[PDB]
Amino acid sequence: SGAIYVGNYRVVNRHLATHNDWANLVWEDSSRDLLVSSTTAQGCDTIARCDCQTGVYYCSSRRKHYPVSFSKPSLIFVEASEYYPARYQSHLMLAVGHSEPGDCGGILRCQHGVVGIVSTGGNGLVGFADVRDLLWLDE
Ligand SMILES: NC(=O)[C@H]1CCCN(C(=O)[C@@H](CN2CCCC2)c2ccccc2)C1
Ligand SMILES: [Zn+2]
């Protein structure tokens, strides 16, 4: 679990969005596993606007933050799960690191701010849904 809080926006994994999130919806994209809902209070996370490929992510299943190198956002095949059939997920970045179901929502950050959130994993890999292209989150 986990979310990004920027301005009057809450960014969560689409597959973990609550009933309150769908009742206050801004934008959602199944192919990216992202959902954005509106908030009454202002958030303080800063979104990174960069091409960094190194950062630190939060891993709830180890209660630890890990430094990682990650790939550029791309269309990656993701195995079928209880939330989606087998499909290509877009804007996804992979790193070598521990992740388990429950870790989705963990933030990945670089020197410029928030890069994305954990969205996939397994076999010693972790995948992050990028949010650096969503320039509208800043206005
Ligand atoms: N964005 C998605 O489509 C994800 C939705 C949740 C599930 N998902 C995953 O990758 C799982 C692993 N899979 C579950 C069934 C086959 C392996 C997982 C593992 C570790 C960390 C996080 C998630 C896919
Ligand atoms: Zn950066």
Side-chain angles (χ1 to χ4, degrees):
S1 69
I4 308 163
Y5 296 94
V6 54
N8 292 270
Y9 297 127
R10 166 170 140 96
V11 185
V12 298
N13 293 92
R14 191 193 184 269
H15 76 273
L16 300 179
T18 71
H19 152 94
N20 197 69
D21 286 325
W22 283 103
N24 287 280
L25 186 61
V26 175
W27 166 91
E28 60 76 26
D29 185 338
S30 186
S31 74
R32 291 179 73 148
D33 186 40
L34 288 179
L35 185 144
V36 176
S37 63
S38 58
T39 77
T40 75
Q42 282 214 253
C44 302
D45 291 330
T46 284
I47 311 299
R49 303 295 176 197
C50 69
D51 61 358
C52 286
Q53 275 184 259
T54 64
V56 174
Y57 78 105
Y58 180 63
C59 172
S60 65
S61 66
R62 294 285 181 274
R63 292 184 184 125
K64 279 234 184 49
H65 299 257
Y66 290 109
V68 287
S69 295
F70 52 93
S71 61
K72 276 182 166 159
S74 67
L75 203 58
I76 300 284
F77 170 95
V78 175
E79 178 119 322
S81 72
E82 293 154 325
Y83 305 99
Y84 300 104
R87 78 212 211 282
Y88 291 95
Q89 178 162 318
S90 64
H91 302 260
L92 185 70
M93 302 172 293
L94 298 188
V96 171
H98 181 65
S99 57
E100 284 171 55
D103 289 323
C104 288
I107 278 170
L108 168 65
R109 60 181 75 258
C110 66
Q111 65 182 107
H112 307 99
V114 173
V115 173
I117 51 171
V118 173
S119 176
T120 73
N123 294 328
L125 298 163
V126 48
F128 306 93
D130 187 52
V131 300
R132 295 176 295 183
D133 66 309
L134 302 170
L135 312 185
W136 57 263
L137 288 171
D138 293 351
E139 55 211 67

Coordinates of all heavy atoms in Angstrom, one line a residue, residues 48-54 110-113 115 132, ligand 2:
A48 N 9.4 14.4 -9.6 CA 10.7 14.6 -10.3 C 10.4 14.9 -11.8 O 9.5 14.3 -12.4 CB 11.5 13.3 -10.3
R49 N 11.1 15.9 -12.4 CA 11.0 16.1 -13.9 C 12.5 15.9 -14.4 O 13.3 16.9 -14.3 CB 10.5 17.5 -14.1 CG 9.1 17.8 -13.5 CD 8.0 16.9 -14.0 NE 6.7 17.1 -13.3 CZ 5.7 16.3 -13.3 NH1 5.7 15.2 -14.0 NH2 4.6 16.6 -12.6
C50 N 12.8 14.7 -14.8 CA 14.2 14.3 -15.1 C 14.2 13.0 -15.9 O 13.2 12.4 -16.1 CB 14.9 14.2 -13.8 SG 14.3 12.8 -12.8
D51 N 15.4 12.5 -16.2 CA 15.6 11.2 -16.8 C 16.5 10.3 -15.9 O 17.2 9.5 -16.4 CB 16.2 11.2 -18.2 CG 17.6 11.9 -18.4 OD1 18.1 12.4 -17.4 OD2 18.1 11.9 -19.6
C52 N 16.5 10.5 -14.6 CA 17.4 9.7 -13.7 C 17.1 8.2 -13.9 O 15.9 7.9 -14.1 CB 17.1 10.1 -12.2 SG 17.8 11.7 -11.7
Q53 N 18.1 7.4 -13.7 CA 17.9 6.0 -13.7 C 18.5 5.3 -12.4 O 18.7 4.1 -12.3 CB 18.6 5.3 -14.9 CG 17.7 5.3 -16.2 CD 18.4 4.5 -17.3 OE1 19.0 5.1 -18.2 NE2 18.4 3.2 -17.2
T54 N 18.7 6.2 -11.4 CA 19.1 5.7 -10.0 C 18.3 6.4 -9.0 O 17.9 7.6 -9.2 CB 20.7 5.8 -9.8 OG1 21.0 7.2 -9.8 CG2 21.5 5.1 -10.8
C110 N 14.3 10.1 -6.6 CA 15.7 10.4 -7.0 C 16.0 11.8 -6.3 O 15.2 12.4 -5.6 CB 15.7 10.5 -8.5 SG 14.7 11.9 -9.2
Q111 N 17.1 12.4 -6.7 CA 17.4 13.7 -6.2 C 16.4 14.8 -6.6 O 16.3 15.8 -5.8 CB 18.8 14.2 -6.7 CG 19.0 14.4 -8.2 CD 20.4 14.8 -8.5 OE1 21.1 14.0 -9.1 NE2 20.7 16.0 -8.2
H112 N 15.6 14.6 -7.6 CA 14.6 15.6 -8.1 C 13.2 15.5 -7.5 O 12.4 16.4 -7.6 CB 14.6 15.6 -9.6 CG 15.9 15.8 -10.3 ND1 16.6 14.7 -10.7 CD2 16.6 16.9 -10.5 CE1 17.7 15.2 -11.3 NE2 17.8 16.5 -11.1
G113 N 12.9 14.4 -6.8 CA 11.7 14.2 -6.2 C 11.1 12.8 -6.5 O 11.9 11.9 -6.7
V115 N 9.6 9.7 -8.4 CA 9.8 9.2 -9.8 C 8.5 8.3 -10.1 O 8.0 8.3 -11.2 CB 11.0 8.4 -9.9 CG1 11.1 7.7 -11.2 CG2 12.3 9.2 -9.7
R132 N 6.7 10.7 -13.9 CA 7.4 11.9 -14.4 C 6.9 12.6 -15.6 O 7.2 13.8 -15.9 CB 8.9 11.6 -14.5 CG 9.5 11.2 -13.2 CD 11.0 10.8 -13.4 NE 11.1 9.6 -14.2 CZ 12.2 9.0 -14.5 NH1 13.4 9.6 -14.2 NH2 12.2 7.8 -15.1
Ligands
ZN2 ZN 15.9 12.7 -11.0

